[PDB]
């Protein structure tokens, strides 16, 4: 029954940073137990056509003005002049299947009214009250209704579709998304990590190799009345430590409050997680941001921008319904009055050619599409067939021609490979990250997690902290937080 000072479950960035902090503080005899055959967790870099590398999990350093993880990276690059990231924010190109490009349009002025909708939402909630949540969709309808006298038909038709790019930030359809949580305050530009794995490896490299135990799935954690904690890997292995920092995803941890021990990733807690933790799961959920990588032979399209969003189909009928609806109740009725296509929801494409010089498109998708697409990620023919219409429309707007299917080995773009994410089906992630359905209050979880199960059983991860909640750097900071409190306690 090997004795350890600290047992960290999960080798994601939280777990990795927690072990880093522990070592950095002189603490010895710690362990990092990871279920998968790799470290990184939701930070994973995959290889595709010709050795091209892509981050299939997180790709950006957000809030570069305050992001501690980013500043740390930025310093290294200032000292050795090595390119670790690239600021790739750009003027968004918006594409409708019909009206073509609708961005920066002298008549539509979509970005302008979008800015107003944003201020409208802020005014709607920033106004401290028992305001009451609703879906993001309902919030946009309420905006259209209140400002219809000041909007053209075209604005009422396309604005709603254009503002849905926010779905790609939460990984949720606007009808499943909480209005109160939709608008986040970006604190500066984003920086595209040129290998998030290099961030993972650098932190992993900061502590004892022998501390890492890969392919070990923790099944249960027990608190001994005799002040200490017992942990069981699935392969018989048993440990007992003074402290444990649990970093498994909110979705995996959620399995704990359910009866059935035979679930890949689920941990049996003894005593079971306190009611404040269990109940918090009813107040926060999990989104499904997913990715699809489209690799072409050569860059043969306009690199006017690295940011392109394809709007879902809209209809003149909708405008009419908005002009004639006498109120929000009636609007929903009139709206209620087939089958999902690549045009049934907005899709977000990153033109990597401009940003990194690679002839590939990194596309983001949201729930429910992500689940369906990830489910057929092996049927490459079906994937191409599904994304062909939009891939073409984009090439059309970027001065190129229809895409050619070259997946089974001049001016025409030829698709070589297609890589799809698998976060919703992977038992050790079960989705992308924490997100809010309407009525959800993310603070309940953050409080319950950061206050721990008890003095010895702690938590870290993107879902356990306010600043950078959902983000890689937030997960990172939570790792540091828990390790610091513990190294201080061990210091005594």
Ligand X SMILES: Cc1cc2nc3c(=O)[nH]c(=O)nc-3n(C[C@H](O)[C@H](O)[C@H](O)COP(=O)(O)OP(=O)(O)OC[C@H]3O[C@@H](n4cnc5c(N)ncnc54)[C@H](O)[C@@H]3O)c2cc1C
Ligand Y SMILES: C[C@@H](CCNCCCCN)NC(=O)c1ccccc1
Q: Does 252 bind ligand X (CB under 6 A)?
A: yes
State how far the Cα of 271 lies from the Cα of 418, in Å rounded to an integer: 46
Site pattern 148..167 for a second copy (x: CB under 8 A)? -xx-----------------
Per partner kind, with CB cut-offs from 5 to 8 A, the member of ligand Y, ligand X, a second copy, none near residue 252 is: ligand X
Neighbours of 394 (CB within 10 A): 25
Q: What are phi and psi of 142, to 5 degrees?
A: -65, -35
> Residue 126 Cβ, how far from a second copy at the closest point, in Å?
10
Site pattern 378..417 for ligand X (x: CB under 6 A)? ----------------------------------------
> Residue 348 Cβ, how far from ligand X at the closest point, in Å?
11
State how far the Cα of 491 lies from the Cα of 485, in Å rounded to an integer: 10
Per partner kind, with CB cut-offs from 5 to 8 A, the member of ligand Y, ligand X, a second copy, none near residue 165 is: ligand Y
For residue 109 the two structure tokens come to 């002025």
For residue 488 the two structure tokens come to 């201080």
Per partner kind, with CB cut-offs from 5 to 8 A, the member of a second copy, ligand Y, ligand X, none near residue 348 is: ligand Y
Per partner kind, with CB cut-offs from 5 to 8 A, the member of a second copy, ligand Y, ligand X, none near residue 9 is: ligand X
Exactly one of 163, 166, 218, 347 binds ligand X (CB under 6 A); which one?
218
Q: Does 128 bind a second copy (CB under 8 A)?
A: no
For residue 193 the two structure tokens come to 């990590």
Task: Specify the residue, 11 or 95, whose C-beta has the smaller distance to ligand X.
Answer: 11
Q: Three-state SS string across 420-478, please?
A: ECCCCCCCCCCCCEEECCCCCCCHHHHHHHHCCCCCCEEECCCCCCCCCCCCHHHHHHH
CB–CB of 34/214 below 8 Å?
yes
Task: Specify the residue, 183 or 239, whose C-beta has the smaller distance to ligand Y.
Answer: 183
| CA 213 to each of CA 34, 263, 407: distance values in angstroms, whole numbers, following the listed order | 6, 20, 38
Task: Specify the residue, 38 or 323, whose C-beta has the smaller distance to ligand X.
Answer: 38
State how far the Cα of 456 lies from the Cα of 454, in Å rounded to an integer: 6
> Residue 93 Cβ, how far from a second copy at the closest point, in Å?
10
For residue 291 the two structure tokens come to 């990715």
Q: Does 442 bind ligand X (CB under 6 A)?
A: no
> Residue 304 Cβ, how far from a second copy at the closest point, in Å?
6
Stretch that binds ligand X, among 33-41, 175-183, 308-316, 390-398 (CB under 6 A): 33-41
Which residues, numbered 340-359, are part of the site for a second copy (CB under 8 A)? Answer: 354
State how far the Cα of 435 lies from the Cα of 388, in Å rounded to an integer: 30
> Residue 302 Cβ, how far from ligand X at the closest point, in Å?
25
Per partner kind, with CB cut-offs from 5 to 8 A, the member of ligand Y, a second copy, ligand X, none near residue 170 is: ligand Y
User: Given the DSSP bridges, would you call strands 307-310 and 347-351 parallel, antiparallel or unpaired?
Assistant: antiparallel
Exactly one of 29, 268, 304, 441 binds a second copy (CB under 8 A); which one?
304
Exactly one of 27, 33, 35, 168 binds ligand Y (CB under 6 A); which one?
168
The tokens 């690239």 sit on which residue? 86
| CA 41 to each of CA 12, 201, 292, 416, 430: distance values in angstroms, whole numbers, following the listed order | 4, 12, 18, 27, 12
Exactly one of 60, 183, 207, 473 binds ligand Y (CB under 6 A); which one?
60
CB–CB of 110/102 below 8 Å?
yes
Per partner kind, with CB cut-offs from 5 to 8 A, the member of ligand Y, a second copy, ligand X, none near residue 429 is: ligand X
User: Given the DSSP bridges, would you call strands 268-270 and 218-224 parallel, antiparallel or unpaired?
Assistant: parallel
In angstroms, the first-to-last Cα distance of the chain is: 25
Q: Does 291 bind ligand X (CB under 6 A)?
A: yes
Q: Does 463 bind ligand Y (CB under 6 A)?
A: no
Give SS3 for 258.
Answer: coil
Total residues found in the chain within this entry:
492
Q: Does 66 bind a second copy (CB under 8 A)?
A: yes
Task: Specify the residue, 199 or 231, whose C-beta has the smaller distance to a second copy.
Answer: 199
- CA 285 remoteness from chain centre: 13
Per partner kind, with CB cut-offs from 5 to 8 A, the member of ligand X, a second copy, ligand Y, none near residue 321 is: none
The tokens 């199960």 sit on which residue? 453
For residue 270 the two structure tokens come to 């003894």
DSSP 359-396: SEEEEEE-BTHHHHHHHTTT-HHHHHHHHHHHHHHHHH
Per partner kind, with CB cut-offs from 5 to 8 A, the member of ligand X, a second copy, ligand Y, none near residue 65 is: a second copy
Q: Does 421 bind ligand X (CB under 6 A)?
A: yes
Residues that bind ligand X (CB under 6 A): 9-15, 33-36, 41-43, 57-60, 62, 216-218, 247-249, 252, 265, 267, 289-291, 421, 423, 428-429, 432-433, 461-462, 470-473, 475
Residues that bind a second copy (CB under 8 A): 64-66, 74, 78, 87, 89-91, 104, 106, 109, 111-113, 116, 119-120, 123, 147, 149-150, 185-189, 191, 304-305, 354
Residues that bind ligand Y (CB under 6 A): 60, 62, 89, 165, 168-170, 190, 289, 307, 348, 364, 433-435, 470-471
């Amino acid at each position: 029954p090997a004795k350890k000072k600290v047992i960290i479950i999960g080798a994601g960035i939280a777990g990795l940073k927690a072990a880093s902090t522990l070592h950095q503080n002189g603490i010895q005899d710690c362990l990092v137990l990871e279920a998968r055959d790799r470290v990184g967790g939701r930070l994973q870099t995959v290889t595709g056509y010709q050795g091209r590398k892509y981050d299939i999990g997180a790709s950006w350093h957000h809030d570069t003005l305050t992001n501690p993880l980013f500043l740390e990276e930025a310093q290294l690059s200032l000292n050795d002049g090595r390119t670790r990231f690239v600021f790739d924010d750009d003027n968004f190109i918006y594409i409708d299947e019909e009206r073509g490009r609708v961005d920066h349009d002298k008549e539509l002025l979509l970005e302008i009214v979008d800015n107003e909708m944003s201020k409208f939402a802020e005014l709607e909630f920033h106004q401290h009250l028992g305001v009451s949540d609703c879906s993001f969709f309902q919030l946009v309808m309420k905006y259209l209704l209140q400002r219809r006298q000041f909007l053209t038909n075209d604005q009422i038709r396309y604005l709603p579709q254009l503002c849905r790019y926010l779905e790609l930030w939460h990984g949720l359809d606007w009808k499943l998304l909480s209005a109160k949580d939709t608008y986040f305050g970006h604190q500066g530009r984003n920086a595209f990590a040129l290998n998030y794995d290099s961030v993972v490896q650098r932190i992993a490299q900061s502590f004892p190799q022998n501390w890492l135990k890969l392919s070990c799935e923790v099944k249960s954690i027990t608190r001994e009345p005799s002040k200490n904690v017992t942990v069981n890997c699935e392969d018989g292995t048993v440990y007992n430590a003074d402290y444990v920092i649990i970093t498994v995803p909110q979705s995996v941890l959620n399995l704990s409050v359910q009866p059935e021990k035979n679930l890949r990733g689920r941990i049996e807690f003894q005593p079971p997680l306190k009611p404040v933790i269990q109940d918090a799961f009813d107040k926060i959920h999990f989104g499904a941001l997913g990715k699809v990588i489209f690799e072409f032979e050569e860059c043969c399209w306009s690199n006017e921008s690295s940011k392109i969003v394809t709007l879902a189909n809209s209809t003149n009928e909708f405008v009419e319904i908005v002009r004639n609806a006498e109120n929000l109740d009636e609007l929903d009725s009139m709206l209620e009055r087939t089958s999902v296509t690549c045009w049934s929801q907005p899709l977000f494409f990153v033109n990597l050619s401009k940003s990194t010089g690679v002839a590939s498109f990194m596309m983001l998708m949201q729930a429910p599409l992500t689940n369906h697409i990830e489910s057929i990620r092996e049927d490459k023919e079906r994937l191409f067939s599904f994304f062909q219409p939009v891939l073409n429309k984009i090439m059309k707007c970027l001065d190129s021609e229809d895409v050619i299917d070259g997946m089974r080995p001049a001016n025409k773009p030829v698709l070589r490979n297609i890589i799809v994410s698998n976060w919703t089906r992977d038992p050790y992630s079960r989705g992308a990250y924490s997100a809010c359905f309407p009525g959800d209050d993310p603070v309940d979880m953050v409080v319950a997690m950061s206050n721990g199960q008890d003095s010895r059983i702690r938590f870290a991860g993107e879902h356990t902290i306010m600043d950078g909640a959902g983000c890689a750097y937030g997960a990172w900071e939570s790792g540091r937080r828990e390790a610091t409190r513990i190294s201080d306690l061990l210091k005594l």
